[PDB]
Short mmCIF file of C-alpha atoms and ligand atoms in Angstrom, two decimals:
data_model
loop_
_atom_site.label_atom_id
_atom_site.label_comp_id
_atom_site.label_asym_id
_atom_site.label_seq_id
_atom_site.Cartn_x
_atom_site.Cartn_y
_atom_site.Cartn_z
CA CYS Z 1 76.79 103.51 117.63
CA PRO Z 2 77.03 106.55 119.47
CA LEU Z 3 74.07 106.89 121.15
CA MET Z 4 71.78 103.84 122.25
CA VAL Z 5 68.59 103.80 124.65
CA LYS Z 6 67.47 100.85 127.16
CA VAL Z 7 64.00 100.66 128.77
CA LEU Z 8 62.88 98.86 131.60
CA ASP Z 9 59.24 97.93 133.54
CA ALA Z 10 59.22 98.48 136.86
CA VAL Z 11 55.39 96.97 136.72
CA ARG Z 12 55.83 93.89 134.89
CA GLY Z 13 59.16 93.22 135.52
CA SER Z 14 60.53 93.14 131.83
CA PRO Z 15 62.16 94.98 129.01
CA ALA Z 16 60.03 97.64 127.90
CA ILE Z 17 59.13 96.26 124.08
CA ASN Z 18 57.94 98.77 121.41
CA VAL Z 19 58.45 102.04 122.78
CA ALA Z 20 58.50 104.96 120.91
CA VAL Z 21 61.93 107.28 121.28
CA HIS Z 22 61.94 110.55 119.88
CA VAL Z 23 65.62 112.72 119.95
CA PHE Z 24 65.62 116.07 119.08
CA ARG Z 25 68.53 118.60 118.92
CA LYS Z 26 68.25 122.03 120.06
CA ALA Z 27 68.61 125.03 117.11
CA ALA Z 28 69.74 128.01 116.61
CA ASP Z 29 66.38 129.37 117.06
CA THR Z 30 63.54 125.38 119.02
CA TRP Z 31 63.83 121.25 119.33
CA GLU Z 32 64.51 119.93 115.70
CA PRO Z 33 63.86 116.56 115.03
CA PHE Z 34 67.33 114.37 114.78
CA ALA Z 35 66.29 110.43 115.04
CA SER Z 36 63.27 107.94 116.46
CA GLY Z 37 62.91 104.65 116.73
CA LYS Z 38 61.51 101.85 118.84
CA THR Z 39 62.75 99.60 121.63
CA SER Z 40 63.37 95.94 120.47
CA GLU Z 41 62.17 92.82 122.45
CA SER Z 42 64.96 93.30 124.88
CA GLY Z 43 63.82 97.02 125.71
CA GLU Z 44 67.09 98.02 123.69
CA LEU Z 45 67.56 100.69 120.83
CA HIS Z 46 70.28 100.99 118.70
CA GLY Z 47 71.00 102.35 115.22
CA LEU Z 48 69.51 105.98 116.18
CA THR Z 49 72.27 107.82 114.82
CA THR Z 50 75.77 107.46 113.05
CA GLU Z 51 78.84 109.13 114.39
CA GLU Z 52 78.93 111.31 111.19
CA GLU Z 53 75.17 112.47 111.82
CA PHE Z 54 75.82 112.86 116.00
CA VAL Z 55 77.35 116.50 116.20
CA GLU Z 56 77.84 118.56 119.18
CA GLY Z 57 74.53 119.82 120.45
CA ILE Z 58 71.74 120.21 123.32
CA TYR Z 59 69.80 116.45 122.65
CA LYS Z 60 66.51 115.73 123.43
CA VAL Z 61 65.40 112.22 123.83
CA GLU Z 62 61.54 111.75 124.72
CA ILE Z 63 60.18 108.34 125.46
CA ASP Z 64 56.65 107.88 124.95
CA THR Z 65 55.44 106.35 127.91
CA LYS Z 66 52.01 107.42 127.80
CA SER Z 67 51.38 104.98 124.54
CA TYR Z 68 53.12 102.56 126.24
CA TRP Z 69 51.27 102.16 129.36
CA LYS Z 70 48.08 102.95 127.73
CA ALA Z 71 48.25 99.84 125.21
CA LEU Z 72 49.02 97.76 128.16
CA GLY Z 73 45.64 99.02 130.11
CA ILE Z 74 47.57 101.02 132.94
CA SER Z 75 47.01 104.69 134.00
CA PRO Z 76 50.19 106.57 133.25
CA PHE Z 77 50.83 110.01 134.70
CA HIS Z 78 53.66 111.00 132.84
CA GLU Z 79 53.17 112.16 129.27
CA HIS Z 80 56.77 111.43 128.23
CA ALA Z 81 60.17 110.86 130.09
CA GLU Z 82 62.26 113.89 128.61
CA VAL Z 83 66.07 113.35 128.82
CA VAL Z 84 68.15 116.48 127.86
CA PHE Z 85 71.98 116.72 127.70
CA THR Z 86 74.81 118.72 126.23
CA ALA Z 87 76.39 115.85 123.76
CA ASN Z 88 80.13 115.71 122.28
CA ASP Z 89 81.41 119.25 123.72
CA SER Z 90 84.99 118.43 124.93
CA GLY Z 91 84.83 115.82 121.78
CA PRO Z 92 82.97 112.47 120.73
CA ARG Z 93 81.64 110.47 122.87
CA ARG Z 94 79.24 106.99 122.97
CA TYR Z 95 76.29 107.84 125.55
CA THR Z 96 73.89 105.29 126.65
CA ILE Z 97 70.62 106.60 127.87
CA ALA Z 98 68.91 103.82 130.74
CA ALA Z 99 65.43 104.33 131.96
CA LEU Z 100 63.23 102.86 134.39
CA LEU Z 101 59.48 103.45 133.82
CA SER Z 102 56.89 102.86 136.45
CA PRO Z 103 53.44 104.76 135.87
CA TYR Z 104 54.11 107.86 138.63
CA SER Z 105 57.73 107.51 138.52
CA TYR Z 106 60.88 107.32 136.02
CA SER Z 107 64.44 107.36 137.00
CA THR Z 108 66.89 107.74 134.26
CA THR Z 109 70.99 107.38 133.88
CA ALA Z 110 73.85 107.99 131.90
CA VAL Z 111 76.50 105.66 130.71
CA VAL Z 112 79.45 108.23 128.85
CA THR Z 113 82.52 106.32 126.92
CA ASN Z 114 85.35 107.90 125.19
CA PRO Z 115 85.74 105.66 122.33
CA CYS C 1 48.80 123.99 148.19
CA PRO C 2 47.96 122.18 145.26
CA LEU C 3 51.38 121.40 144.02
CA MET C 4 54.67 121.03 145.70
CA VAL C 5 58.18 120.43 144.39
CA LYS C 6 60.90 118.31 146.93
CA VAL C 7 64.55 117.94 145.71
CA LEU C 8 67.02 115.94 147.00
CA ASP C 9 70.78 115.40 146.64
CA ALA C 10 71.81 111.57 146.69
CA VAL C 11 75.21 112.55 146.27
CA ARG C 12 75.57 114.28 149.79
CA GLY C 13 72.52 113.45 151.24
CA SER C 14 70.83 116.78 151.84
CA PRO C 15 68.21 118.51 150.48
CA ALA C 16 68.91 120.69 147.10
CA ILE C 17 68.98 124.15 148.09
CA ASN C 18 67.84 127.15 146.08
CA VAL C 19 67.54 125.35 143.18
CA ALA C 20 65.33 126.77 140.56
CA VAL C 21 62.17 125.31 139.16
CA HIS C 22 60.14 126.23 136.44
CA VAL C 23 56.39 124.78 135.53
CA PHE C 24 55.15 125.43 132.37
CA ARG C 25 51.14 124.28 131.02
CA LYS C 26 50.79 123.17 127.26
CA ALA C 27 48.58 125.93 125.18
CA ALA C 28 46.34 125.11 122.48
CA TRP C 29 54.89 125.76 126.65
CA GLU C 30 52.78 128.68 129.07
CA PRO C 31 55.21 129.82 132.04
CA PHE C 32 52.88 128.53 134.88
CA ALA C 33 54.60 128.79 138.06
CA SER C 34 58.33 128.98 139.44
CA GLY C 35 60.65 129.48 142.28
CA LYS C 36 63.90 128.26 144.04
CA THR C 37 63.88 125.78 146.67
CA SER C 38 64.43 126.49 150.27
CA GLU C 39 66.65 125.21 152.62
CA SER C 40 64.82 121.96 153.25
CA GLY C 41 64.90 121.41 149.29
CA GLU C 42 60.88 122.18 149.13
CA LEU C 43 59.18 124.98 146.73
CA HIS C 44 55.95 125.52 148.10
CA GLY C 45 53.61 128.36 147.14
CA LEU C 46 54.06 128.11 143.34
CA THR C 47 50.11 128.16 142.70
CA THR C 48 46.47 128.48 143.69
CA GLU C 49 43.22 126.43 143.61
CA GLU C 50 42.03 128.83 140.85
CA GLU C 51 44.98 128.94 138.82
CA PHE C 52 45.54 125.04 138.54
CA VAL C 53 43.57 123.57 135.94
CA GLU C 54 43.49 120.33 134.55
CA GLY C 55 46.18 120.44 131.73
CA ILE C 56 49.56 118.90 130.70
CA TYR C 57 51.90 120.66 132.72
CA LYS C 58 56.04 120.31 132.83
CA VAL C 59 58.17 120.85 135.89
CA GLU C 60 61.43 122.05 134.81
CA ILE C 61 64.48 121.66 137.71
CA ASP C 62 67.43 123.59 136.75
CA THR C 63 69.69 120.77 137.93
CA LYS C 64 72.88 121.69 135.82
CA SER C 65 73.25 125.09 137.85
CA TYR C 66 72.62 123.44 141.47
CA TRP C 67 75.81 120.73 140.34
CA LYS C 68 78.05 123.30 138.93
CA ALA C 69 77.68 125.20 142.07
CA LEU C 70 79.25 122.43 144.08
CA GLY C 71 82.00 122.46 141.62
CA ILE C 72 80.46 119.08 139.95
CA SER C 73 80.18 118.30 136.13
CA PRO C 74 76.82 116.94 135.25
CA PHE C 75 75.31 115.45 132.56
CA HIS C 76 71.73 116.78 132.40
CA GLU C 77 70.65 120.32 131.30
CA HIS C 78 67.81 119.86 133.55
CA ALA C 79 65.42 117.27 135.20
CA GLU C 80 62.21 118.36 133.02
CA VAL C 81 59.13 116.51 134.15
CA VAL C 82 55.77 116.10 131.64
CA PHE C 83 52.20 114.81 133.08
CA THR C 84 49.09 115.10 132.93
CA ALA C 85 46.77 116.68 135.74
CA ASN C 86 43.01 115.06 136.03
CA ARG C 87 47.34 117.59 145.60
CA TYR C 88 50.40 117.07 143.93
CA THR C 89 53.86 116.77 145.24
CA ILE C 90 56.98 116.12 142.82
CA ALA C 91 59.87 114.89 144.09
CA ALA C 92 63.51 115.08 142.42
CA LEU C 93 66.18 112.60 143.40
CA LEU C 94 69.87 114.49 141.90
CA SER C 95 72.91 112.72 141.09
CA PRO C 96 75.86 113.97 138.54
CA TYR C 97 74.30 111.20 135.78
CA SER C 98 70.96 110.39 137.05
CA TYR C 99 67.68 111.58 137.98
CA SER C 100 64.73 110.11 139.32
CA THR C 101 61.20 111.95 140.04
CA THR C 102 57.94 110.83 141.45
CA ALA C 103 54.72 111.95 141.95
CA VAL C 104 52.24 111.58 145.26
CA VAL C 105 49.13 112.51 145.39
CA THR C 106 47.46 113.25 148.48
CA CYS E 1 63.05 112.40 165.20
CA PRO E 2 66.35 111.25 164.80
CA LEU E 3 64.85 108.96 162.06
CA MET E 4 62.04 109.13 159.74
CA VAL E 5 60.81 106.39 157.30
CA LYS E 6 58.94 107.44 154.24
CA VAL E 7 57.05 105.24 152.06
CA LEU E 8 55.91 106.21 148.57
CA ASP E 9 53.82 103.96 146.01
CA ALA E 10 55.08 104.16 142.20
CA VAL E 11 52.14 102.91 140.44
CA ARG E 12 49.31 104.38 141.99
CA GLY E 13 50.79 107.83 142.74
CA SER E 14 49.85 107.52 146.68
CA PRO E 15 51.84 107.29 149.81
CA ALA E 16 52.00 103.45 151.09
CA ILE E 17 49.77 103.22 154.19
CA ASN E 18 50.33 100.50 156.66
CA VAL E 19 53.15 99.13 155.61
CA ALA E 20 55.26 97.53 158.40
CA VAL E 21 59.09 99.30 158.68
CA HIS E 22 61.18 97.39 161.09
CA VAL E 23 65.03 98.76 162.10
CA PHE E 24 67.57 96.36 163.32
CA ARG E 25 70.76 97.55 164.53
CA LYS E 26 74.19 95.13 164.23
CA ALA E 27 75.39 93.58 167.56
CA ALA E 28 79.07 93.00 168.22
CA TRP E 29 71.32 92.42 163.74
CA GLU E 30 69.25 93.19 167.30
CA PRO E 31 66.22 94.41 166.55
CA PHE E 32 65.84 98.35 167.26
CA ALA E 33 62.56 100.01 166.05
CA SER E 34 59.34 99.31 164.35
CA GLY E 35 56.21 100.60 163.41
CA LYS E 36 53.39 100.73 160.45
CA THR E 37 53.06 103.52 158.01
CA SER E 38 50.47 106.34 158.42
CA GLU E 39 47.89 107.51 156.15
CA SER E 40 50.61 110.39 155.09
CA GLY E 41 52.76 107.24 154.28
CA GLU E 42 55.00 108.23 156.81
CA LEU E 43 56.63 106.51 160.02
CA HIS E 44 57.79 109.10 162.98
CA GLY E 45 58.24 108.23 166.67
CA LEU E 46 61.01 105.01 165.65
CA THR E 47 63.69 106.43 168.36
CA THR E 48 64.89 108.46 170.27
CA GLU E 49 68.31 110.80 170.58
CA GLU E 50 69.26 108.62 173.42
CA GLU E 51 68.95 105.45 171.88
CA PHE E 52 70.29 106.03 168.49
CA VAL E 53 73.82 105.69 168.48
CA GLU E 54 76.29 105.52 165.88
CA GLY E 55 76.52 101.87 164.46
CA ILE E 56 75.67 100.08 161.48
CA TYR E 57 71.32 100.13 160.83
CA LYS E 58 69.04 98.16 158.64
CA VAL E 59 65.63 99.35 157.62
CA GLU E 60 63.06 96.61 156.54
CA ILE E 61 60.27 97.31 154.53
CA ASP E 62 57.75 94.73 154.08
CA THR E 63 56.37 95.63 150.69
CA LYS E 64 55.63 92.15 149.94
CA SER E 65 52.36 92.07 152.23
CA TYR E 66 51.62 95.90 150.96
CA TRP E 67 51.50 94.39 147.17
CA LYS E 68 49.77 91.12 148.19
CA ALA E 69 47.09 93.61 149.84
CA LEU E 70 46.48 95.32 146.84
CA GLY E 71 46.09 92.15 144.20
CA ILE E 72 49.51 92.44 143.03
CA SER E 73 51.97 90.10 142.84
CA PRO E 74 55.50 91.74 144.22
CA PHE E 75 59.19 90.47 143.04
CA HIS E 76 60.85 91.43 146.58
CA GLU E 77 60.48 90.16 149.81
CA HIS E 78 61.07 93.48 151.11
CA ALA E 79 62.75 96.22 150.64
CA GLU E 80 66.04 96.08 153.43
CA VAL E 81 68.34 98.98 153.41
CA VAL E 82 71.96 99.24 155.22
CA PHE E 83 73.70 102.02 156.01
CA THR E 84 76.32 103.36 159.12
CA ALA E 85 74.97 105.87 160.70
CA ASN E 86 78.02 108.47 161.91
CA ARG E 87 68.71 113.32 161.84
CA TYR E 88 67.88 111.08 159.06
CA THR E 89 65.07 110.35 156.72
CA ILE E 90 64.87 107.03 154.90
CA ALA E 91 62.90 107.57 152.02
CA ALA E 92 61.59 104.50 149.77
CA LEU E 93 59.67 104.50 146.40
CA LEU E 94 57.71 101.26 145.82
CA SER E 95 56.71 99.57 142.35
CA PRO E 96 55.97 95.56 142.08
CA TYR E 97 59.43 94.60 140.42
CA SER E 98 61.95 97.55 141.51
CA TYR E 99 62.09 99.97 144.48
CA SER E 100 64.34 102.88 145.43
CA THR E 101 65.96 103.77 148.40
CA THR E 102 67.40 107.32 149.40
CA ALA E 103 68.93 108.62 152.87
CA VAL E 104 68.48 112.43 153.25
CA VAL E 105 70.16 114.30 156.69
CA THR E 106 68.86 117.31 158.06
CA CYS O 1 72.44 82.24 132.80
CA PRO O 2 69.86 82.13 134.95
CA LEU O 3 71.03 85.00 137.23
CA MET O 4 72.56 87.58 136.04
CA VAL O 5 73.52 91.45 137.80
CA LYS O 6 73.84 94.44 135.87
CA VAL O 7 75.35 97.54 137.80
CA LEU O 8 75.69 101.00 136.80
CA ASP O 9 77.70 104.04 138.63
CA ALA O 10 75.46 107.50 138.72
CA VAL O 11 78.36 109.87 139.97
CA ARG O 12 80.78 108.61 137.35
CA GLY O 13 78.56 108.07 134.45
CA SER O 14 79.68 104.42 133.85
CA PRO O 15 79.24 100.73 134.76
CA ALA O 16 80.46 99.83 138.17
CA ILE O 17 83.38 97.91 137.45
CA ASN O 18 84.80 95.23 139.61
CA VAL O 19 82.00 95.75 142.45
CA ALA O 20 81.56 92.42 144.58
CA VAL O 21 78.38 90.84 144.71
CA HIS O 22 77.38 87.95 146.99
CA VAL O 23 74.29 85.58 146.65
CA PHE O 24 72.93 83.73 149.63
CA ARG O 25 69.66 81.29 150.15
CA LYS O 26 67.70 81.27 152.87
CA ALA O 27 68.41 77.77 154.94
CA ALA O 28 65.78 75.52 156.80
CA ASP O 29 67.18 77.54 160.17
CA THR O 30 70.09 81.52 158.06
CA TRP O 31 71.42 83.04 155.45
CA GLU O 32 73.76 80.12 153.46
CA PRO O 33 76.44 80.82 151.12
CA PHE O 34 75.26 80.36 147.40
CA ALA O 35 77.52 82.21 144.70
CA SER O 36 79.74 84.98 144.51
CA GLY O 37 81.68 87.30 141.61
CA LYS O 38 82.69 90.36 140.58
CA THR O 39 81.07 92.81 138.01
CA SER O 40 83.22 92.80 134.45
CA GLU O 41 84.49 96.33 132.83
CA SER O 42 80.87 96.47 131.43
CA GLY O 43 78.96 96.42 134.67
CA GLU O 44 77.74 92.77 134.38
CA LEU O 45 78.23 89.59 136.13
CA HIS O 46 77.06 86.53 134.08
CA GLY O 47 78.29 83.22 135.55
CA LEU O 48 76.88 82.84 138.74
CA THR O 49 75.11 80.13 138.64
CA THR O 50 73.91 77.13 136.62
CA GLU O 51 70.80 75.73 136.01
CA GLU O 52 71.32 73.21 138.14
CA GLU O 53 72.58 74.69 141.04
CA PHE O 54 69.62 77.72 141.25
CA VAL O 55 66.66 75.77 142.98
CA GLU O 56 63.75 77.40 144.20
CA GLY O 57 64.47 79.16 147.65
CA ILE O 58 64.71 82.75 148.71
CA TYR O 59 67.54 84.45 147.78
CA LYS O 60 69.75 87.48 148.75
CA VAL O 61 72.24 89.28 146.22
CA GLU O 62 74.18 91.85 148.80
CA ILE O 63 76.31 94.19 146.40
CA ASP O 64 79.27 95.64 148.12
CA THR O 65 78.93 99.28 147.69
CA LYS O 66 80.64 100.42 150.53
CA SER O 67 84.37 99.03 149.34
CA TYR O 68 83.41 100.69 145.44
CA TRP O 69 82.80 103.74 146.96
CA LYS O 70 85.87 104.07 149.64
CA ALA O 71 88.08 102.98 146.57
CA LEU O 72 86.76 105.88 144.46
CA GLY O 73 87.51 107.92 147.47
CA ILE O 74 83.96 108.64 147.98
CA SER O 75 82.19 108.63 151.05
CA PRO O 76 79.57 105.92 151.14
CA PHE O 77 76.00 105.68 153.18
CA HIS O 78 74.77 102.18 152.64
CA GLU O 79 76.79 99.16 153.55
CA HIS O 80 75.77 97.46 150.83
CA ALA O 81 72.64 96.75 148.57
CA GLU O 82 70.39 94.04 149.74
CA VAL O 83 67.98 92.65 147.26
CA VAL O 84 65.92 89.75 148.59
CA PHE O 85 62.86 87.45 146.33
CA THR O 86 61.89 84.07 146.12
CA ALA O 87 63.09 82.11 142.89
CA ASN O 88 61.86 79.72 140.79
CA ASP O 89 58.35 78.84 142.90
CA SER O 90 55.91 78.07 139.63
CA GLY O 91 58.86 76.88 138.15
CA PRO O 92 62.32 77.74 136.81
CA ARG O 93 62.83 81.43 135.45
CA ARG O 94 66.19 83.61 134.32
CA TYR O 95 66.38 86.23 136.42
CA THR O 96 68.54 89.86 135.53
CA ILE O 97 68.77 92.07 138.88
CA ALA O 98 70.02 95.73 137.83
CA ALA O 99 70.92 98.16 140.43
CA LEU O 100 72.09 102.04 140.20
CA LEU O 101 74.16 103.11 142.50
CA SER O 102 74.58 106.85 144.43
CA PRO O 103 76.53 107.36 147.65
CA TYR O 104 73.27 108.19 149.38
CA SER O 105 70.80 106.35 147.15
CA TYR O 106 70.62 103.08 145.19
CA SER O 107 67.85 101.87 142.93
CA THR O 108 67.19 98.14 141.86
CA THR O 109 64.73 96.27 139.63
CA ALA O 110 64.36 93.06 138.43
CA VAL O 111 63.61 91.18 134.91
CA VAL O 112 62.24 87.84 134.95
CA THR O 113 62.06 85.72 131.85
CA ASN O 114 60.47 81.93 131.53
CA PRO O 115 62.97 80.27 129.13
CA1 CA K 201 83.15 122.67 121.64
CA1 CA K 202 38.32 116.37 132.56
CA1 CA K 203 82.53 107.33 165.44
CA1 CA K 204 56.95 75.84 144.55
#
């Protein structure tokens, strides 16, 4: 699994469950859809892509924080958290993008490994 | 100011100086405002009360150029940052492989 | 000031007002300075250039009392925060189950 | 496993490997040693304690960031990151403490589950 996403909720002290994650890749010209999914009961999203699909490029991972907070009855500030990075440029790597969410703040970090 | 940006470096423990910041507003992204961080890591003067209407905004901080100037290989292209406005300070704390961003209303 | 503390609330998007802050210095923890956050979430006036010598300091922010006043059940007792000093701003961003803290030197 | 700790490195984009973690419990009078260990190659520390040992109380988890950064040739600011919470007060829970480290900043969050 070359691209994994893990999301935690700083208001509830829990995994962020059933949060939508969309991945786009930058096109020749615009953001083209690449892969999407929803976080699990552990806050994790595995199975986005495959080694064969995951080419070099500039990717955007957008986590739908607005829907997540609204469904919980919380007022979100950010529409979404938008993590943008160059992948695979010096060869294939495995990436984990972790995100910690609050209504008016988020943080995100990357773990990169060389398989 | 209706909108202020502050950028801090978590590796060196210093303000992030001369970092480019662009703000965009969602149209029916229209560039909306931009500048470069001061010696204090702050950017004031972006907009006015008149122009800053309710809507969806994106603040994008060119973190990649900042790290490269320092000789450090960064992960991200930029710390974007996207919110609905319904006085705002947007703060960003930068590391090579992480960032956090927060909004404060005064 | 040699030492400033700022506290922000990540749930409400506001400065954290009237939060108690205690600073301690490691002895051969001696209370060193303390106060309460202003309407801006800031605490100035903690110490002087004379008293603030190199050493190991702990800044402890009473986050539990802040959340309880708001009617929110918090995880932490306090966001402590412990560093070696060799002008410092200590910033803390608070959520019920998380905090982050950063130091900036000017 | 009622108490787990996971640590990531924001400078390197990696797990924080072989970082010392000490847990103390507040005593009747002072911090009494409770449990300690080192993070794994995945940045995780399992096996700190057992359900039988983990009683209600005020715990301090101290992560030795100073040694970790010094061994990597980086200048640390914080001596250590000191996470302090009441545990088990309304009954036993499982706790994960996650920490993201940089030289001049750290964040930490809790995931609490009711087994
Ligand atoms: Ca290439
Ligand atoms: Ca309106
Ligand atoms: Ca000295
Ligand atoms: Ca009890």
